[PDB]
Design a protein around this ligand. Structure first.
Ligand SMILES: Nc1ncnc2c1ncn2[C@@H]1O[C@H](COP(=O)(O)OP(=O)(O)O)[C@@H](O)[C@H]1O
Ligand SMILES: [Mg+2]
Ligand SMILES: [Mg+2]
Length: 263
């Protein structure tokens, strides 16, 4: 179907791990999209061929406003290309760098859009397992959109034995190896809600063994400006027990969420 020679490459949209992401227009259509370039050599050397496989499959059959679409993909002698949907406003990561902190109104709305998309994924038994400012994109109308389903999985799962990852947004179960479920995304949605209000993750540390400790111990504190409503929602998601964590409906209904969110 598609070939590199079908597209006009634009400017570098962002930097991934197995390759950068670029802007690009379809030659006859003039359709603007993002082309995620991945190097086969690097993918092989890391043995993540199966992860790119799931990412492509899962995301491709996904259909939700708050979820970045994956039209198709194709490839060549050296790299693999993923035809994604273009996110004009960039990432929540950059927006967080710009504003340092987000207000409750902006955070509540960013949480609803995320809880909606996550619900849609969990309804199909799909865990993202990698929800963070870098993989959260903003659409034309500033709406949120979860992307990078590289760690996404159709399941109840165990690890893949490795871990490139800023533990920050990872749940206790994963960080330690156990058999996890969809409740990991609820945990991330807590770290995220805290980072949006404070400006940094709740388990941030200077080392990977210091962060490891705080996440497993669930060691975090709230700054004074963090209202009681936010403190309650965050304290419910960040449970050490996957079972105690609330359901996406208790999140979409939570008093703080319904009193500040616009969506
Ligand atoms: N469709 C897109 N539009 C704009 N930027 C993108 C897009 N896809 C990815 N990026 C940028 O690339 C970065 C990394 O690519 P991503 O695919 O999300 O993760 P990975 O590191 O697994 O490749 C993101 O943090 C983001 O800044
Ligand atoms: Mg990424
Ligand atoms: Mg990834």
């Amino acid at each position: 179907q598609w070939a590199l020679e079908d597209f006009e490459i634009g400017r570098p949209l962002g930097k991934g791990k197995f390759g950068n992401v670029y802007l690009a227009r379809e030659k006859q259509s003039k359709f603007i999209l993002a082309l995620k370039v991945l190097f086969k050599a690097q993918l092989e050397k890391a043995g993540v061929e199966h992860q790119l496989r799931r990412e492509v499959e899962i995301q491709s059959h996904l259909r939700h406003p708050n979820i970045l679409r994956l039209y198709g993909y194709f490839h060549d002698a050296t790299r693999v290309y993923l035809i994604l949907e273009y996110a004009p406003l960039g990432t929540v990561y950059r927006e967080l760098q710009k504003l340092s902190k987000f207000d409750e109104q902006r955070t509540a709305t960013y949480i609803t859009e995320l809880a909606n998309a996550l619900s849609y994924c969990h309804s199909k038994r799909v865990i993202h397992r990698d929800i963070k400012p870098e993989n959260l994109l903003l659409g034309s109308a500033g709406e949120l959109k979860i992307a990078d389903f590289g760690w996404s999985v159709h399941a109840p799962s165990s690890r893949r034995t490795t871990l490139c990852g800023t533990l920050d947004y990872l749940p206790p179960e994963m960080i330690e190896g156990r058999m996890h479920d969809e409740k990991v995304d609820l945990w991330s949605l807590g770290v995220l809600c805290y980072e949006f209000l404070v400006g940094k993750p709740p388990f941030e540390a200077n080392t990977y063994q210091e962060t490891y400790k705080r996440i497993s111990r669930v060691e975090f504190t709230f700054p004074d400006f963090v209202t009681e409503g936010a403190r309650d929602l965050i304290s419910r998601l960040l449970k050490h027990n996957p079972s105690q964590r609330p359901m996406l409906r208790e999140v979409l209904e939570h008093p703080w969420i319904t009193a500040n969110s616009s969506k």
